[PDB]
Amino acid sequence: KHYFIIENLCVGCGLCLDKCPPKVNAIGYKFYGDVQEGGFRCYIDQAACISCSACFSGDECPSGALIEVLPDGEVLDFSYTPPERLDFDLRFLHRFHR
């Protein structure tokens, strides 16, 4: 398990804190500068954090900083990312959308 958070990507919203049991207190705010410019980020204490996976399974991260490393080493920004699609629009010639 050993979940990590990328402070470069994190914007400091703290929904991980709400998704963490109060008895563990693994998520914590770290302040860097002005709050309105991004300021504080969030960090996980690996020793305290013991494989709950509530944070990632909640899939609440807007920034995708909440990452999950696997025993084989693959990293996940989101539980299920939408597939990448070759996008190109449809316009019927004789229909009203032309």
Q: Show Cβ contacts of residue 20 under 8 Å, excluding neighbours closer than 6 positions.
A: 26, 27, 52, 54, 55
Residue 2's binding partner among other proteins, ligand SF4, none (Cβ under 5 to 8 angstroms by kind) is none
Give CA separation, 36 vs 12, 24, 57, in Å. Answer: 10, 28, 28
Residue 76's binding partner among other proteins, ligand SF4, none (Cβ under 5 to 8 angstroms by kind) is none
Residues 64, 10 contacting (CB under 8 angstroms): no
Q: Any known ligand binding at 49?
A: yes
Q: Any known ligand binding at 24?
A: no
Residues forming contacts to ligand SF4 in the complex (CB under 6 A) are: 3, 5, 10-16, 19-21, 24, 26-27, 42, 44, 49-50, 52-55, 60-63, 65-66
